[PDB]
Structures are given as structure tokens and as C-alpha cells.
A paper describes a structure:
Although NDRG3 has a high structural similarity to the α/β-hydrolase family, the substitution of the residues of the enzymatic catalytic triad and narrow folded cavity due to the presence of helix α7 and helix α10 indicate that NDRG3 is a nonenzymatic α/β-hydrolase fold protein. Compared with NDRG2, the helix α6 region of NDRG3 is a flexible loop.
Interestingly, although NDRG2 and NDRG3 share high similarity in terms of their sequence and structure, the helix α6 region in NDRG3 ΔNC was disordered, whereas that of NDRG2 was presented as a clear electron density map. To Increase the space for the helix α6 region, we designed a disulfide-deficient, denoted as NDRG3 C30S. The crystal structure of NDRG3 C30S mutant was determined with four monomers in an ASU at 3.4 Å resolution.
Author numbering:
A (entry chain A): 29 to 317
B (entry chain B): 29 to 169, 183 to 317
The structure:
């Protein structure tokens, strides 16, 4: 049913898990998780969902785990030159090659969404679709003006990442979802290693995507060539960014999905609704008639 | 590099024009023109355009001419039972069968867009994509050439009566057998509601039925269609649908602005994975 690989790249080992058996012409639904998650935390709930299972039947699922984020990962030595976001994306063609895959339908969350998007800009041949959840193509704001002070380099990691995931009101309520995902961030990931991955995602440069004007397309400023499903909860802190990302992609190949009564982790909070959206998206490309 | 066929169906002959040789698994780009046009009037301008030629290259093109609307068509006897819009759509599977075509990427205008939309609802597996130009999915509720001019061109556009409009008066007037054109107009004005309805991601929505293919709705900012085309968009699945309002444009976007619409169509094809 499942098969783990530790794949060697010029930027270090990356751990991937292939559940289901890849097919001749069919692409694999490839997965990159967000900061403070691994593949298991981010999507295992979503891909185990009854309706999604009928989709994962036809496609093989290759879960990528960002370097050092894989469960039971050893700490990198303090000097360690953890890969840049751009570099993390340069690890994926090796992954595809090693598993003899020809193309992928990506599903990314935050850091994942950026990585897969960079990857798809770098390698349009290997990307057919992207479902980008809570994606931010702009570089991290040096300050959030909706706060009481600035204290960037002297606050807890787990609390930073929680904030990145969950809306202000959702986080203050501190319900089973938040308590559950404090514990996931604190215990499931190597805290030493996680700091490096966080730092990589916080250092991300601007994607550079710009929507083209159909008339007089001379400059042809680059965007994603593939079909894209941008997904964000109404109450995700991401909404500002995800709408901006949509403002910079080709509307003929892009759809925005603002999920109702939703915050961080739409794929776990409302997997029933997101599945059906993914199903329509796949049907667009000609799969799952 | 073209071939004409008169294809006899249960509901009568339909004249089609295949330019290019069909591939085994690639769909053909199939065409259905609007009231008061034929494929030449409606699409010849667009499909010959430089940038489109490089697309049409990799697909076969199959141009359908609505009954009696094809060039040199003889007038049907006065009693003649002209096909309903629903019937006109039922004539397409036979066209596909007889030319041994497996599936199509449809480009419709007005009546054409309804007909190809009806077709897709009836036979989803056969439709892979639809470029619906100036489509109207609702029912309507003297001089025929003037009526049709009005259907096509914006009020301001039409009052200005420039090269485009005086060219297309003559097209409507002299290209198509006038007896037949009335019957076709009658069929399009009788069109029933498509009965598409946008699905709610939570409600299963069994009763509601929508196009299951990738759709590019196209209208010019000044087209009388705009209200209807936006209506259409509001009733299709947003995950499989894009609305394209074309700047400084009225009737016949595909003629007025082929450069823009080509580019749109190329990205729409790239969405489904073709012309990589």
C-alpha cells in the first residue's frame, strides 16, 4: 500500500512516501507540506477522507517531506546551510527522476505552495496542475502593523508557526484544532531543524509572477503555465496574500476558492468540500470523468 | 488543405468543412456559427489569423454549417419543419460518428454557443472544452437582416454603421439563403432555458445540472450579450469556467480582436494540457 524513499539531491536528502502504485501516462498527486508540519500532520486526514480515497485510487500519491521535517529526523549540525526556498524546489526534479515519474499534480500548503509554484515556473513540463492552499508569493512583511510591538528575534518558534497557520480569533479561542496543532508542531518535528525550515520560508524572495495583458503581450512577464486552484479559508491570515497571488496569475488557467466558515488548514477542517473542488479541478484537465 | 461533407442525419443534412487531418486521441476544434452567419462569415477571419494558424496546425478543424445556412444552400419548401435548437444539437453526434471523431473542443457564437452547450450537457464525454462567444442560456420571453444586426452589434456600434456593420449587413443579406435564415432565427428565438445551475460545494445538488467540461465564456464589453454571458457564468462551475470580457469590443470579438482571443484560446488549450 505504501513505500518510503530517502532521495539524494545536490541540496541534501529529501524523504518521500509513495502510497499507491504509479501508472504509465497518469501523473502522481505530489505533496509539499507547510512550516511546522510534515506530510502526516498536513494531509493524512485529507487523503484518508472517504470521497478523496476514490480519487487517490486512480492516481499514485507521492508525499514530499521538507529536509529535516520528516518524523524522527536527526538535527542538522548548527552551521548547516539549509536550502533556500528556490533550492528546496530544485530538489523535486531529482525526486520525479528517481521514482521514474513524468509529471505531477501538486498540492502545497504555505511553504509547500510557494516551493511547488517555483518548481512549476522552473519546470512547466513536469507540472500539469497545482492546488495551492494558503500560498503567499510576496516576501515576508518586515512588520505586521496589526500588533502592539516588534520583537522578531526573541519569541517562541511554535507560537510563531501557530500564528502563521490560524486566524487571530481562531487562535485566541484555542479549541481542539489549535491545542492539537500546538502539540503537532512541538513534538512531531525536530525543533532544531524546524527553525532552519521556518528561516528558509521567512527568507523566501518574491515569486515575480505577473498576470499578462492579453492584448500586446510583448514583455510576456512569466507566470504558472498550468491550471491552478488557489484555496484559502475566509478566516485564514493568508486570505490577503492568496487573493494577491490570484491577482498575479493568468485568470484563464486559475480559480480562487474562498472556503466558508474556515481558517487555517482547510484540508483538515473541511476535507469534504475541498475534495469536491479538487474533483472538479481534475475533471477540468480531463482526468476522473 | 480542406474537405467538404454533406452529412445526412435523422433530422436532415448538415454541411461541414474539415480543414486538417484528425489525430487518433487529440480532439478536433469543432465550430458552430451564429444566426445570420455561416462558418466563413463567423470564423474564416479568426482561424486564418497568423497566431491561430500555429494552434489549428496541431488540431484538425471541423466547421459545422447550421441546416440551410451553408453557402449556396437551396431554400427549404415553405411548410418545412426546421429543427429545434435542441434537435440542432442532436445533429452533432452523427457528424462526429461519420467523420470517425472521438471528442471535440467546441467554439460557438450565440446560437452556436447554445447548440454546443446543449450538446455538452447531452454528451459530456464528447466535449473536452467549450469557447462560448456571446452565449445566452435563457429564452427570449420586422426586417430580418435588421433584427440579426441588432442581435450581433451594440446600440452605439450599430448607430455608427462603420465598415464592420455595413460589411456584415451585406454578409447577413447576400451570403445566406434568406428563406432558410428566417427558419434558423425562429429556432434560436424559440430556444428553451439551458437549465444549467452552479453547484454548491456542500449540497450534493442532484437535480441541478451543469457543463462538466472546461469552459471559456467570451463577450465584448459593448456586446448586447454581456448581461446574458455574465448570467451564464453565474450558473456554471467556477472551478471549470473563466469569463473573458474583451476591452473596446462589441459584436464578433473573434473578427474585431483575433489577436487577443487567439492568445486567450491558446492559454485555455494549455489549461487542458494541449499545445505545450
Amino acid at each position: 500500500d505504501s513505500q518510503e524513499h530517502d532521495i539524494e539531491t545536490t541540496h541534501g536528502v529529501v524523504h518521500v512516501t509513495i502510497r499507491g502504485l504509479p501508472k504509465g501516462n497518469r501523473p502522481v498527486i505530489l505533496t509539499y507540506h507547510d512550516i511546522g508540519l510534515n506530510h502526516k500532520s498536513c494531509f493524512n486526514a485529507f487523503f484518508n477522507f472517504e470521497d478523496m480515497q476514490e480519487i487517490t485510487q486512480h492516481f499514485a500519491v507521492c508525499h514530499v517531506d521538507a529536509p529535516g521535517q520528516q518524523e524522527g529526523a536527526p538535527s542538522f549540525p548548527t552551521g548547516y546551510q539549509y536550502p533556500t526556498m528556490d533550492e528546496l524546489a530544485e530538489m523535486l526534479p531529482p525526486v520525479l527522476t528517481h521514482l521514474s515519474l513524468k509529471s505531477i499534480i501538486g498540492i502545497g500548503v504555505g511553504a509547500g505552495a510557494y516551493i511547488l509554484s517555483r518548481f512549476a515556473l522552473n519546470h512547466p513540463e513536469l507540472v500539469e496542475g497545482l492546488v495551492l492552499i494558503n500560498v503567499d508569493p510576496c516576501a515576508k512583511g518586515w512588520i505586521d502593523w496589526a500588533a502592539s510591538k516588534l520583537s522578531g528575534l526573541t519569541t517562541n518558534v511554535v507560537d510563531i508557526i501557530l500564528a502563521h497557520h490560524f486566524g487571530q480569533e481562531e487562535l485566541q479561542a484555542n479549541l481542539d484544532l489549535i491545542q492539537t496543532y500546538r502539540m503537532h508542531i512541538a513534538q512531531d518535528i525536530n525543533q532544531d531543524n524546524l527553525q532552519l525550515f521556518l528561516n528558509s520560508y521567512n527568507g523566501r524572495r518574491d515569486l515575480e509572477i505577473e498576470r499578462p495583458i492579453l492584448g500586446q503581450n510583448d514583455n510576456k512577464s512569466k507566470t504558472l503555465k498550468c491550471s491552478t486552484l488557489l484555496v484559502v479559508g475566509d478566516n485564514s491570515p493568508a486570505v490577503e496574500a492568496v487573493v494577491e497571488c490570484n491577482s498575479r496569475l493568468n485568470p484563464i488557467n486559475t480559480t480562487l476558492l474562498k472556503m466558508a466558515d474556515c481558517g487555517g488548514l482547510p484540508q483538515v477542517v473541511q476535507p469534504g468540500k475541498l475534495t469536491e473542488a479538487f474533483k472538479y479541478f481534475l475533471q477540468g484537465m480531463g482526468y476522473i470523468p
